[PDB]
């Protein structure tokens, strides 16, 4: 995945 950080 990409930057899935909230």
């Amino acid at each position, epitope marked *: *995945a*990409p930057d899935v950080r909230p």
Partner: single-chain antibody
Amino acid sequence: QVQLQESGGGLVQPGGSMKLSCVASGFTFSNYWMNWVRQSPEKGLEWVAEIRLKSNNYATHYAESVKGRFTISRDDSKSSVYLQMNNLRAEDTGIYYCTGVGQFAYWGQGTTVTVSSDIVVTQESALTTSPGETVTLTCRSSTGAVTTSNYANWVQEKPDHLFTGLIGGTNNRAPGVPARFSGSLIGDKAALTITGAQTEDEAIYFCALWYSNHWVFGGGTKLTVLG
């Protein structure tokens, strides 16, 4: 207000070099990957590079078009991201934006550079709606069906080249984005729905799809809001 303040553009000769800067405020810069994206008349919106976190040893990835010539870096102690551009060519001409977070919520204001698996993502060229209507934009991949593994993003461009992210991760509304915007997957395309279009929503909408280790942007949809 998040701000991403860019500098460093100009007017350069084929074969020259230039370094762009972008300084972040209003969010925890060092927790998020950062990207450079450029806009040209010739090639629409094009993702250029990403850098991940200190915990990833600041790992980088580049579009094939710039690999070997461009270098992305960051300085977490100054909340800044940079793009060193070597061996510039006519085709590198355009407006350069630093952007990130969820995954393209926040865009810098842009800095102009004037130099003097071949995936296509397809959006409707234009759509026309009226205030109060429900309108759906779509985003198709040449590779087959769009899935949640393409982490579809939607971004809005308003006059003079002002970008804001609406949706990331298929259907997550970026912070403070109006409730009338939503993201979906509908018949193997990604979709943005405006439920009750407003006059101010007249704009160009872009989608971006992730393929393992890079982004591809669609050509954008010009939405006109009449009446």
